[PDB]
């Protein structure tokens, strides 16, 4: 739903520009360069839709508070056009790498999107509840009927109930109408079925806090530069952070899908019983984890034992493993392995004299 | 296993005895305590790729067989509600009809009188 997506982005940027004058240039930079890199939205048209409120019409927009006008469809794609039955192939158009501070932001963005979407989907329940609350002629004749419309404040007049509720959300965000009036509007129109919008203010505040942290945290310029500079696995698992997790973000355009995967997680704290644990646990992981990054303790020295220029340059690191698999399914005589079962000393890696390894490749 | 053992009580000076009788030890089911008595370095995805292709092949064969047996699964499982109606209306004795009549007799709790008829036992 492009409408709901633009509304979510507009809400976060509006909250930032209203409640936080500081860091305004940096938040423009973020919302204008980093987020489109992950969402594949159209650059210039997203720019127009955002500076529709980012630069003037704070008191002017505070007074006006109109519904943000939406442009036409926003779609960006590379040289991949065409779709047929039985071959509706897909591709990870944009693949980025990130950390916890951005993972939380995407999760909050998704929460906000889901709740605005569910809010839009109650248009028929609006009329059902309005029919439910209807005066009784006997009560009117007995002079005991107190209408409920005379309690609402100035209600906006847009085309859609969703737009009216959106203007009300913006009013709460800016700080005009209080929580009581907002909840009373929600109860008059949506009954007791819109109970998830009540904490939309806290949700937007958390999203803006994560945006500010992303853009101005301890390694802010470093991570933003290593993101915006432009095949990045050993170009992304080198830096150090306070025990974070590495994430892979993928965007598919033919389906409008967004995928979050967990890559290697940074190492935990070392222990003293590892000397006795290695006898059973360590070798199990190190051997059964065939060609996969073992993660017990690795921070100290990881001088990459091969230059990155030797590997053939390629995009979409997911297919590098396919290249390796195709290579492995080739002329290699490929004797099994060294068969080095010695840990009785538990201080070093030892081998057996026989059990060489043959022509590993070809 | 303590959910289905008959409860018992051990004294608080109970040396755990190790019974040497290899077979045939009557033990009251519950008082038997813990029954006390290569590194390859493969590093290949060859077997993983082969296993993935094998799984896809098994899946392909299964799907092929099932999707051919469609158009008969439909006829024999979706019209299965009207053939019972046939063998009920035109009362033809099959095993399930007679089991349903046993069900109705067990509901009515007959004793020694004659069974009325196939369509006139009356929990109607």
């Amino acid at each position: 739903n492009e409408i709901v997506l633009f509304d979510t982005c507009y809400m976060v940027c509006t909250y930032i520009v209203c409640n936080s004058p500081s860091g305004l240039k940096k938040v423009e930079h973020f919302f204008k360069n980093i987020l489109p890199l992950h969402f594949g939205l159209e650059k210039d048209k997203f720019s127009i839709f955002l500076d529709q409120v980012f630069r003037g019409p704070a008191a002017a927009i505070k007074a006006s508070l109109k519904y943000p006008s939406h442009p036409d469809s926003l779609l960006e794609h590379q040289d991949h056009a065409g779709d047929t039955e039985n071959e509706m192939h897909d591709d990870v158009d944009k693949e980025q790498f990130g950390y916890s501070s951005m993972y939380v932001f995407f999760r909050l963005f998704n929460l906000l999107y889901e709740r605005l979407y569910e809010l839009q989907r109650l248009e028929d329940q609006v009329s059902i509840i309005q029919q439910r609350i209807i005066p009784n002629p006997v009560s009117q004749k007995q002079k005991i009927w107190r209408d409920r419309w005379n309690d609402l404040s100035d209600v906006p007049d847009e085309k859609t109930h969703y737009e009216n509720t959106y203007v009300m959300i913006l009013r709460l965000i800016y700080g005009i109408v209080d929580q009581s009036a907002f909840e009373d509007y929600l109860r008059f129109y949506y009954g007791n079925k819109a109970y998830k919008i009540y904490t939309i203010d806290k949700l937007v505040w958390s999203a803006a806090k994560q945006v500010h942290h992303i853009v101005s945290d301890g390694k802010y310029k470093f991570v933003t530069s290593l993101v915006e500079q432009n095949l990045y696995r050993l170009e992304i698992e080198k830096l150090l952070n306070p025990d974070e997790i590495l994430f892979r973000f993928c965007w598919i355009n033919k389906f409008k899908s967004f995928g979050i995967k967990i890559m290697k997680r940074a190492n935990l704290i070392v222990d003293q019983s590892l000397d006795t644990q290695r006898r059973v646990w360590k070798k199990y992981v190190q051997n059964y984890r065939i060609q996969k990054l073992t993660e017990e303790i690795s921070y100290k020295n990881y001088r990459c034992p091969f230059l990155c220029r030797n590997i053939e340059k390629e995009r979409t690191v997911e297919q590098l493993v396919s290249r390796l698999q195709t290579k492995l399914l080739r002329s290699a005589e490929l004797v099994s392995g060294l068969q080095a079962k010695l840990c009785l000393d538990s201080f070093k890696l030892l081998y057996l004299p026989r059990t060489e390894d043959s022509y590993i490749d070809a | 296993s303590d959910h289905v053992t008959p409860r018992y009580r051990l004294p608080e000076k109970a040396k755990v005895i190790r019974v040497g009788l290899p077979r045939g030890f009557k033990n009251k089911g519950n008082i038997v305590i813990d029954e006390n008595e290569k590194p390859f370095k493969l590093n290949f995805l060859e077997q993983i790729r082969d296993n993935v292709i094998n799984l896809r092949k098994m899946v392909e064969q299964d799907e092929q067989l099932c999707i051919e047996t469609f158009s008969k699964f439909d006829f024999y499982a979706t019209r299965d509600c009207e053939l019972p109606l046939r063998i009920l209306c035109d009362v033809a004795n099959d095993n399930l009809e007679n089991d349903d009549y046993v069900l109705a007799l067990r509901d009515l709790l007959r004793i020694s009188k004659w069974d009325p008829n196939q369509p006139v036992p009356a929990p109607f």
Binding site: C250 | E63, I67
Partner: peptide, 17 residues
């Protein structure tokens, strides 16, 4: 047949994630 094989492959491409 080949149609069912194409269906299985397309399902795999569509739900490989």
């Amino acid at each position: 047949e080949l149609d069912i094989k194409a269906f299985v492959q397309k399902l795999g491409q569509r739900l490989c994630h």
